[PDB]
């Protein structure tokens, strides 16, 4: 087994999900996500996406191995990214135009890759993520990002027209839940519903990043979305009130409109945040717009 030969060196993330460790394997750093037995279905779902669908892309976290024994240990072993999550990186780092755009374009490219079905023996189904957020995005050494955590992924194939929703009781992070998830109007049997939930979350991530880009000597501090109106670890109900009832969206600072880049990002965000899921931009459209700037 790969698991047998790994030396675990330091814990770099703790939580309800489990833990993530920097470890060593054959003289190289690797990341080991150790799942609680409560989250066994997420482990299996990631394992199938990586090891059966062969999901691989420069902006998706690189799989190395999966191991389980049983009383029960469930390991997912991936490339290790020493800069940490986008959430970690944004707390200490400010950005310029080049590094801001490199970040958001890479996330869009990863998300477009998930969303688009590819045909052939080397292909893949269309995939929606369902827990996109800044903690589930890693910053790589080259300044681009990659998307992690496919435990809630749902798939669709045009040939069968089958929605593969899997069987996981876990639900998305509440802070990033789209209006239609919070008011339970989401059309659960339509694959496109899940893509539009990702786009909502992507919009929130764009906001998080854009705040940290310096323009005209000004930058905002890191805040999570809805920091001003819900507590830490907000409830389903806290979010429903803010997003559905009050129809609140994250505030766009007026200073952004005097910078061309932040002006473009502000326009994209707003078109990720429509209450009508159908009106939201596609991942491909976001990628194309970010490529044009
Ligand atoms: C497997 C592996 C990871 C994963 C891959 N690399 N990595 C680095 C970290 C990580 C997080 C934080 C830090 N540091 C924090 C303090 N300041 C310096 C950086 C350093 C590394 C966390 N998780 C991962 C992962 C990340 C999110 C979700 N699922 C995952 C599943
Ligand atoms: Ca084993
Ligand atoms: Ca922020």
State the number of CA atoms in the 13 A half-sphere of 140 facing the CB: 16
Name the DSSP letter for residue 282.
Answer: P
Residue with tokens 């052939």: 120
Residue with tokens 């501090």: 221
What token pair was written down for 200?
């909502």
Name the DSSP letter for residue 85.
Answer: B
Cα distances (Å, whole numbers) of residue 231 to 37, 148, 228, 240, 241: 29, 25, 8, 13, 13
Residue 32 DSSP SS3: strand
CB of 76 shorter than 6 A to ligand 1? yes
Tell me the C-alpha distance between 144 and 106, whole Å.
Answer: 6
Q: Output the CATH code of domain 1-82.
A: 3.30.200.20
End-to-end, the C-alpha distance of the chain in Å comes to 47
Per the annotation, does 197 bind a ligand?
Answer: no
Phi and psi torsions of 240, nearest 5°: -55, -45
Q: Nearest C-alpha to atom 15 of ligand 1 is from which residue?
A: 84
CB of 20 shorter than 6 A to ligand 1? yes
Q: Give the burial class of 235: count Cβ atoms within 10 A of its Cβ; 0-12 exposed, 13-18 middle, 19 or more buried.
A: exposed
In Å, what resolution does this model reach?
A: 2.1
What token pair was written down for 19?
């833990």
E strand residue ranges, 95-168: 126-128, 137-139, 145-147, 154-157, 162-164
State the number of CA atoms in the 13 A half-sphere of 99 facing the CB: 18
Per the annotation, does 15 bind a ligand?
Answer: yes
| Range(s) within the chain of domains with CATH label 1.10.510.10 | 83-293
Q: How far is the CA of 68 from the centre of ligand 2 (A)?
A: 5
| Range(s) within the chain of domains with CATH label 3.30.200.20 | 1-82
Point out the ligand 1 atom lying closest to the alpha carbon of residue 135. Answer: 27
Q: What is the per-residue DSSP string for 38-50? A: GGHHHHHHHHHHH
Q: How far is the CA of 284 from the centre of ligand 2 (A)?
A: 39
What token pair was written down for 5?
């030969």
CB 108 within 8 A of CB 101: no
225: closest CA among 148, 135, 290, 162?
135
Tell me the C-alpha distance between 244 and 248, whole Å.
Answer: 8
Q: Output the CATH code of domain 83-293.
A: 1.10.510.10
Per the annotation, does 13 bind a ligand?
Answer: yes
Residue with tokens 């675990």: 8
Contacts of residue 253, Cβ cutoff 8 Å, sequence gap at least 6:
211, 220
Residue 24 DSSP SS3: strand
Method by which the model was determined: X-ray
| Number of the ligand closest to the Cα of 253 | 3
Which residues are marked as active site?
Answer: 131
What burial letters (b/e) apply to 143-168, b meaning 16+ CB within 10 Å?
Answer: ebbbbbbbbbbbbbbeeeeebbbeeb
Q: What is the per-residue DSSP string for 194-241? A: HHHHHHHHHHHHHHHHHTTB-BTTB-PPP--TTTTTS-SS--HHHHHI
């Amino acid at each position: 087994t790969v698991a047998r030969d790994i030396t675990l060196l330091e814990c770099v993330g703790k939580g309800r999900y489990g833990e993530v460790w920097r470890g060593s394997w054959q003289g190289e750093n690797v990341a080991v996500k150790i799942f609680s037995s409560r989250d066994e279905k997420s482990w299996f779902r990631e394992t199938e996406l990586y090891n059966t669908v062969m999901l691989r892309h420069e902006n998706i976290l690189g799989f190395i191995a999966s191991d389980m024994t049983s009383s029960t240990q469930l390991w997912l072993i991936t490339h290790y990214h020493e800069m940490g999550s986008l959430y970690d990186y944004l707390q200490l780092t400010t950005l310029d135009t080049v590094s801001c755009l490199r970040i958001v374009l890479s996330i869009a490219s990863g998300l477009a890759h998930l969303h688009i079905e590819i045909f052939g023996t080397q292909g893949k189904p269309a995939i929606a993520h369902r827990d996109l957020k800044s903690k589930n995005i890693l910053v790589k050494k080259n300044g681009q990002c990659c998307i992690a955590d496919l435990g809630l992924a749902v798939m669709h194939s045009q040939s069968t027209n089958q929605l593969d929703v899997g069987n996981n009781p876990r639900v998305g992070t509440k802070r990033y839940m789209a209006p239609e998830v919070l008011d339970e109007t989401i059309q659960v049997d339509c694959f496109d519903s899940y893509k539009r939930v990702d786009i909502w979350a992507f919009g929130l991530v764009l906001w998080e990043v854009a705040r940290r880009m310096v323009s005209n000597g000004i930058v905002e501090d890191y805040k999570p979305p809805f920091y001003d109106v819900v507590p830490n670890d907000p409830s389903f109900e806290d979010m429903r009130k803010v997003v559905c009832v009050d129809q609140q969206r994250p505030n766009i600072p007026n200073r952004w409109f005097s910078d061309p880049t932040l002006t473009s990002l502000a326009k994209l965000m707003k078109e990720c945040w429509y209450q009508n899921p159908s009106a939201r931009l596609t991942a491909l459209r976001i990628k194309k717009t970010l490529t044009k700037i």
